[PDB]
Design a protein around this ligand. Structure first.
Ligand SMILES: CC(C)(C)c1ccc(-c2nc3c(NC(=O)[C@@H](O)CO)cccc3c(=O)[nH]2)cc1
Ligand SMILES: [Zn+2]
Lengths: 161, 47
């Protein structure tokens, strides 16, 4: 695949800033916890850096195209993405298989500023049937994974909702 | 996979109702995101 995962130490400034963004963007959800569980905070177990030369160069090439179409402004953000396909994403990169055809804003790939919003999709649409072991959308035992991603928004269409 | 609105590169979903909710975003080219950090975690039961 070409991907390697570098485990970060909890003492690393880069671990601590990523943990902080994870924890500070939790919110309550209108479903009372139905899809993603009931919680105000996480226990962070590991943070790994994803390194893949081809995928990085594919990203920066598109970033430059977007930037030149938008007064030299990629409008780059760091956002969360939860999906049952995280393991494929990190090795193969994002593509149309990771888009939600039936999503509110069209057949695209969805990202969130609230880490707790992405947590609702770790086990699939609406939390699916919850964790594989216990079939529990609010499982406090089983380990979950999210991605913290670098995303190019360019000129973004504003949708009020 | 669909197209961006003409002349745009993404969509911002603005939480017009929920006071505390932050924005959500959609892209239509997978080359517009790179997965930088893989975070392993548990949610925690409130006390
Ligand atoms: C189908 C498939 C590939 C398993 C899949 C489907 C959805 C997701 C996802 N959605 C998200 C989302 N979606 C919405 O607001 C829409 O659902 C509104 O219609 C909003 C914010 C974040 C996410 C997120 O982090 N992930 C991931 C994978
Ligand atoms: Zn479980």
């Amino acid at each position: 695949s070409g991907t390697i995962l570098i485990d970060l130490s909890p003492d690393d400034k880069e671990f601590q800033s990523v943990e902080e963004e994870m924890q500070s963007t939790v919110r309550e959800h209108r479903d009372g916890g139905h899809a993603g569980g009931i919680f105000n905070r996480y226990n962070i177990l590991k943070i790994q850096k994803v390194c893949n030369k081809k995928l990085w160069e594919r990203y920066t090439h598109r970033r430059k195209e977007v930037s030149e179409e938008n007064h030299n402004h990629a409008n780059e953000r760091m956002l969360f993405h939860g999906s049952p396909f995280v393991n494929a994403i990190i090795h193969k990169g994002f593509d149309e298989r990771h888009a939600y055809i039936g999503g509110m804003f069209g057949a695209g790939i969805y990202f969130a500023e609230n880490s707790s919003k992405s947590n609702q999709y770790v086990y699939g649409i609406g939390g699916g049937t919850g964790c594989p072991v216990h079939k529990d959308r609010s499982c406090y035992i089983c380990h979950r994974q999210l991605l913290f991603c670098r995303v190019t928004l360019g000129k973004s269409f504003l949708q009020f909702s | 996979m669909a197209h961006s609105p003409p002349g745009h590169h993404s969509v911002t979903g603005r939480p017009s109702v929920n006071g505390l909710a932050l924005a959500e975003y959609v892209i239509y080219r997978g080359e517009q995101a790179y997965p930088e950090y893989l975070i392993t975690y548990q949610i925690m039961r409130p006390e």
